[PDB]
Design a protein around this nucleic acid. Structure first.
Lengths: 366, 170, 110, 260, 366
DNA sequence: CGCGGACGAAGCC
DNA sequence: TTATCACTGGCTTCGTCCGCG
C-alpha cells in the first residue's frame, strides 16, 4: 500500500535551486556539508509535468478575485460589476464577514490573504455562481459595506472539488478547514551522496560599445554553483490516494503518471545557463506493505571521493538494501532499473529493462 | 604541539629565504600545488623533514612555499582574520570585497583553502601587512579535523577585531 | 540615597542592555536568515544576571565591575556578552551568519 | 523485571516536531545544543500503531486513553525518554517561497517569501517497560506477550508524522539493543554526553561508543541481564551488548521469550 | 521539439577563459577537479557568430544615453540638446520618474544602472522618436528637474523589438518587465572528460635595451594554462523559439545557423598567445520530443589516462547513449558525425558524413 | 416536531 | 535590478438559532 521510489541522479554544475543569495541549499549531514534540492521545488516540477500531461490543471494563486473578475468581464459584465461580484465571491465565505484581504493596491483587485489551490474549471464555476445572482450583487454594490449574498454551501462545495494534484499532494486552506485534503505523496529533500563544496564562478557582463572605463578597472559579480550525485526518495500512500480520488483506476493512472513524471522532471534552476537536464542513473521501486523505508542512512557516511561516485553509490544502496531486507523481513515487491551493467545488484529485486516497464510492472503489482 | 614544528619552519625558512636566492626560487615554484606534484619536489630538500592527518603535510608545504613567494618589499597571539581587519582599517584596503573573499574561503575544503588562499594572503602581505605564519600553518593543519571550526574562528576574529578597532577610534 | 542610586543605576543598565541584547539577537537571526536565540539568550542572561546584581548591591567585587563607584561599571555588558556568545556560538559558523551575528554583537559593547 | 530498549535511529533533513516557532525542539546537553523529538510525540505515534495493530491492554501498557475519563490507572509502566542527537546540530534554515500562478505584467513577485527551520541527525532513542506491573495489571501472561512483543516492534517501526509530506524522514533504526534487566533500568544516554565530532558520519562511531559504555557499566555492575542487539552493519562486533541476531523481529521474539 | 546537441572537442594548452587570477575555471566533478569553459563565455562567442553571420546585431550596453546622443548629434542637434534629449529618452520610462542612473561622469553622459539588450536599428528608431519632439525637448532642457515628455507606450513598444540573438537566448530588463523574453536555448558548461591539473607556465618579458644586472636576474611572473578534451552540450526548445520569432521559417534559419555557429566558434580567450582553434572530434545531434537528456553522467568517472582520451571518450559516449535508449525508450531522431573511423558507434543513430549535412538533415527533420 | 450542534453576549480598548 | 513577506487556535456559561432527524 506504500509505493516508494528511490533514485540516484547526477547533476553537473547545476545550481538548480538557490537560497536567497544564490548559494545552493546545503545540509550538514553526517558531519559533512552536502548540497540539496529542496523538496517543494521538485514537487512543483513534478506537479507541473503531471498536470501538463494529464490535461487537468490546478491553480495555486493568491489573486483569485482578479481572475474571476476577468472571466465575469468576458461574460458581459461591466468592469465595476465584475469587480464587485468577485469581491462578493470571496466575501461570502468564512466564519467572519469574509476572507481576509491584503491592503488594496491602486488600480487592481485585492489579493487574497492565503493562497488557493483549486482546479481551473472550479474558478469558472465560481464565476457562474456569481453570475446567476447578478441583481443581488448590483444592488449590494451601492451599499457602503456589502455583505456576502452568494450561498455559502454551494461555494464551499465548489471549493472542495479535487484535481489530481490535490489528491496526490494535498491542499490546505485554513479559513475553510472542510476543504483541506491530506496529501498522498511524501517527497524527500534530494541531497548529494558525497560532500560537495560550493564552487564559485566569477562572471562578467560585457558592455558592447567600447569605452576605456568600461574595461580595465571594471569588475563584475561572482556567482555560486555546485554539482553532484543526488539521492532522491518519495512515497505514495496508496490507500489514502484511493480514498482521495475515490476510484481505483484513476489512482492507478495518477500513480503511474506521477512516477514517470518523478523520473522525467528537473527543477529548472538557471537551466538556461547550465542545461542540467539528466536522467537518473538508478531507480528502485518497491511496493511496501508494512511501511515505507527510505535509504538515506545508507549515505549518512559521506563518500570519500577521488573516483566516480555513481558506481560506489549504487553498490552502497544495493548493499544497504540487502541488509535491510535481512534485518526487516518483508514480502514487499522490489525492483530496479539501472544504466550500469557492471553489477547485478541482487538485493534490489527483479531487474526491469526500462523505467516505464518498471513503473508499469510495479504499479500493476499494487 | 604542531605549532612547535611550525615555529621551526618559520625561523628556518624565513631565515633560509632572505639568506638564499636559489632555495627561495626553488620553493616558490610550488605555491598552490599538491605535495604530490613533481614540480614542488625541489622544495622537499628544505621543508620535508619537519612534517610532523595527511592534510598537515599539505599545510606545511603550502604556507612554506606561499610564504616564500612574496616580493622583497614584504620581507622584513593574533590570527589571520584580525590581520585582515587591521589591514582594512589601517592600510585602507577594500573592506566589502575582502569580505566576500573571506566568506568564500570559510566554506572551502582542505584542498580548496590552499587554492583560494594564495591570492588574499600574498596580496595581503603586499602593502606590508603583518601575518603570523605559525598560526596560519596550524590553521591549515586544522582543516584536516575541524575545517568549519577554523573557518569560523577566522571570520569571527575578522569581524570582532574590525568592530573593536572601529569603536576604539571613538 | 547613594546606596539607592547605585541600585537604580544598576537595575537600569541591567534591563536596558538586556533588552538591547533581545533586539540584537532577534534582528541578528532574521537578517542572517534574511528567533530561537532570544528565548535561550534571556534564560541564561537573567539566570546569570541576578547574582551579579546582588553582588553589586552588597558592594562585593564582581568581575568587570569596580567596587564602591557610583557609575554602573558595565558589568552587565560582560554578562550579556557571555550569554550572547553562549547562545549564538554554533551559528557563527557559516561566514554570512557570522557576519550578521558579530556586527550585531558589537552593539552590546556600549 | 524491566525490559528496556536503546536505539540509534538516524533521520535525514527533517523537522519531525517543532516548537511554538518553526525551529525543532532542542536540549542543550554536554555544552552542545542538540535537536530532540519530545517523548510524548513519539509515544503518541507508538500508541496509534500499537492500538491499530491490536485491532484493556492500552490503558495498562500506556497510562490512560487520551479521550477517556480517568479509570484509576493513570500510570502506564512505560517510560519513554526524549530522543536527542548524538552530535551537536546547528538548526539548518530552509528558505522557501510559494509561487503565484497567475502573473501580471510584472515579473516574479512571488506569492509568499519565508524561511522554515529543519535539522538532521542520529537520534539516540530509549524506552523501558515494567513487566511486573504489566503482569499484575493485565492478568493473563499471554496478553503480556502480545503487548510487549507488539509494542516493541511498534517501538522500532514507527516514526512521528510531522512535516513528513515535505520531508520523507521514514527510516529504520540502525542499532537496537533490548536488555532484559532485573536489577534496574539504565539508559546509555551519558555515553553521548560528549557530542561526537563530525565529518565522517556517526552510525559506526556511535555504535562503538555505546559499546564502550555498555562494557564499562557492565564492569561496575556485573548482572544476570539477558541481552542482544541487532544492527544493519556486519563489519563491527559489539561484544558488550550481548549475542548478535540477524534481524529485529528475531531479537524481539528472543527477548519476549526471555522475559517468561 | 527539443533539439539537443552533444559534442566532444579537444583543446591544446587552451586557457580559454580565466578567473580573476588567470587560472582556468575548474569543477570538482565526480570527485576530481576538471577545467571548464563557462557557458556564458562560449554563449557570447556563439551569439557573436550568429548575429554577425545572420546580419542582425544586438547591443548589450549600460551606456545607451551616450549612443543615442551620438545619433541625434549626427542628425544635426547640438551636443547639449542631444544629451538632454537622450536623457529624456531614458527618463520617460518606468514606473517611478525614470530608469535608475549611475552617477554622472564629467564630460560624458551617465551610464544606466542596468544593461540594455536591444538591436542596433532599434536604437536608431529611439533616436527618431526623440527627434520628432524637438521643441518639447528644447523647452524641457531649461527646467531644473526636467520631466519625461516622450510617449511611454511608443518607447516601450520599441524596446520590445527582438533580435535573433534575443529570440534565441532571451533577455532581461527588470525595470521594463514588458520587454523580458524567455530564452529558447540552454547552454551547458563544457568540462573536461578527464582530470586536469593546472600547468603553471613561467614566462618573462625581455627588456630590449641591454642592462648587465637585469640579464642575470631575469625575473618575471608565471601564468597558468591547461589542456583537455571538453564535453559540450546544448538544447534548443523549438516551440518556445517559434513563439519568440513567431514564424517557423525564421526559426529554421535561426536554429540551423545556430547549430553551425555552435560547432564553428571558439571563445578566443588568450589566443594570440595560444592558437586553440579546433573543431569538435564528435558531434551528436538528437531531436527529442519528450525531453532533452544530457550525457554528462557518462563522464562523471574521470578517464584514467596515459593513452589518448579521444577514442575512449567517444566510445564511452556511445555506450551511454546506447544504455539510455535502452533505459528510456523514445522515438527521438538521432544522428552523428565523427572524425575517427576506428568505430561505427551504432547507438548514435544514422551517421552523416559532414557537420553541415548533419545539421541540415536534423533541422529539416524537426 | 424534536433534538443536536454551533455561535454569540461580555469583559476590553 | 524588482517583486513577493498566510492563516488558524488552544478564555468564561448558557441560550439561541439552525440543521437534522
Amino acid at each position: 500500500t506504500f509505493v516508494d521510489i528511490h533514485a540516484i541522479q547526477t547533476l553537473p554544475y547545476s545550481n538548480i535551486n538557490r537560497d536567497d543569495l544564490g548559494s545552493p541549499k546545503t545540509v550538514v549531514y553526517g558531519g559533512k556539508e552536502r548540497t540539496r534540492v529542496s523538496s517543494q521545488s521538485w514537487k512543483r516540477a513534478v506537479r507541473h509535468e503531471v498536470e501538463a500531461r494529464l490535461g487537468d490543471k490546478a491553480v495555486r494563486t493568491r489573486r483569485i478575485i482578479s481572475e474571476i473578475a476577468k472571466r465575469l468581464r468576458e461574460r458581459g459584465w461591466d468592469a465595476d460589476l465584475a469587480d464587485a461580484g468577485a469581491r462578493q465571491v470571496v466575501l461570502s465565505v468564512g466564519k467572519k464577514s469574509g476572507i481576509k484581504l491584503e491592503k488594496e493596491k491602486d488600480s487592481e483587485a485585492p489579493a487574497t490573504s492565503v493562497l488557493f489551490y483549486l482546479p481551473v474549471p472550479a474558478i469558472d464555476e465560481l464565476a457562474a455562481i456569481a453570475d446567476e445572482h447578478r441583481d443581488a450583487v448590483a444592488k449590494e454594490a451601492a451599499k457602503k459595506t456589502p455583505k456576502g449574498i452568494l450561498p455559502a454551501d454551494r461555494i464551499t462545495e465548489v471549493l472542495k472539488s479535487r484535481n489530481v494534484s490535490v489528491n496526490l499532494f494535498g491542499r490546505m486552506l485554513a479559513e475553510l478547514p472542510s476543504t483541506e485534503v491530506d496529501g498522498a505523496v511524501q517527497f524527500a529533500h534530494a541531497f548529494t551522496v558525497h560532500g560537495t563544496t560550493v564552487e564559485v564562478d566569477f562572471f562578467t557582463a560585457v558592455d558592447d560599445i567600447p569605452k576605456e572605463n568600461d574595461h580595465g578597472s571594471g569588475h563584475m559579480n561572482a556567482g555560486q554553483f555546485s554539482a553532484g550525485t543526488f539521492y532522491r526518495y518519495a512515497n505514495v500512500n496508496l490507500d489514502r490516494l484511493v480514498e482521495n480520488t475515490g476510484d481505483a483506476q484513476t489512482a492507478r493512472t495518477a500513480v503511474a503518471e506521477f512516477l514517470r513524471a518523478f523520473l522525467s522532471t528537473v527543477p529548472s534552476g538557471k537551466q538556461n545557463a547550465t542545461a542540467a537536464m539528466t536522467l537518473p542513473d538508478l531507480v528502485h521501486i518497491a511496493v511496501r506493505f508494512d511501511r515505507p523505508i527510505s535509504f538515506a542512512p545508507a549515505f549518512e557516511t559521506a563518500l570519500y571521493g577521488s573516483d566516480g561516485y555513481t558506481l560506489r553509490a549504487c553498490q552502497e544502496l544495493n548493499n544497504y538494501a540487502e541488509r535491510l531486507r535481512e534485518v526487516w523481513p518483508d514480502d514487499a515487491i522490489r525492483g530496479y532499473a539501472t544504466v550500469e551493467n557492471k553489477t547485478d545488484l541482487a538485493a534490489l529485486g527483479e531487474r526491469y529493462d526500462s523505467y516505464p516497464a518498471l513503473i508499469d510492472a510495479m504499479v500493476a503489482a499494487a | 604541539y604542531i605549532l612547535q614544528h611550525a615555529d621551526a619552519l618559520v625561523k628556518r625558512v624565513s631565515k633560509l629565504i632572505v639568506n638564499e636566492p636559489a632555495a627561495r626560487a626553488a620553493l616558490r615554484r610550488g605555491v598552490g600545488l599538491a605535495p604530490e606534484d613533481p614540480r614542488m619536489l625541489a622544495a622537499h630538500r628544505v621543508v620535508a623533514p619537519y612534517v610532523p592527518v595527511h592534510a598537515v603535510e599539505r599545510a606545511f608545504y603550502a604556507v612554506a612555499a606561499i610564504m616564500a613567494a612574496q616580493p622583497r618589499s614584504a620581507r622584513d597571539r593574533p590570527n589571520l582574520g584580525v590581520s585582515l581587519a587591521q589591514a582594512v582599517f589601517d592600510k585602507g584596503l577594500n573592506a566589502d570585497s575582502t569580505e566576500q573573499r573571506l566568506h568564500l574561503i570559510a566554506r572551502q575544503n582542505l584542498d580548496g583553502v590552499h587554492r583560494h588562499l594564495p591570492r588574499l594572503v600574498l596580496y595581503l602581505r603586499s602593502d606590508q601587512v603583518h601575518i603570523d605564519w605559525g598560526i596560519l600553518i596550524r590553521d591549515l593543519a586544522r582543516w584536516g579535523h575541524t575545517p568549519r571550526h577554523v573557518a569560523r574562528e577566522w571570520v569571527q576574529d575578522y569581524h570582532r577585531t574590525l568592530e573593536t578597532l572601529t569603536r576604539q577610534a571613538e | 540615597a547613594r546606596i539607592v542610586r547605585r541600585i537604580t543605576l544598576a537595575r537600569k543598565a541591567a534591563e536596558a542592555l538586556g533588552r538591547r541584547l533581545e533586539k540584537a539577537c532577534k534582528e541578528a537571526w532574521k537578517e542572517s536568515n534574511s528567533g530561537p536565540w532570544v528565548q535561550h539568550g534571556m534564560s541564561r542572561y537573567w539566570a546569570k544576571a541576578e547574582p551579579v546584581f546582588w553582588n553589586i548591591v552588597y558592594d562585593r567585587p564582581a568581575q568587570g565591575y569596580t567596587p564602591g563607584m557610583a557609575g554602573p561599571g558595565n558589568a552587565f555588558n560582560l554578562v550579556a556578552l557571555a550569554a550572547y556568545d553562549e547562545v549564538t556560538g554554533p551559528y557563527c559558523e557559516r561566514p554570512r551568519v557570522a557576519k550578521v551575528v558579530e556586527r550585531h554583537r558589537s552593539t552590546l559593547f556600549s
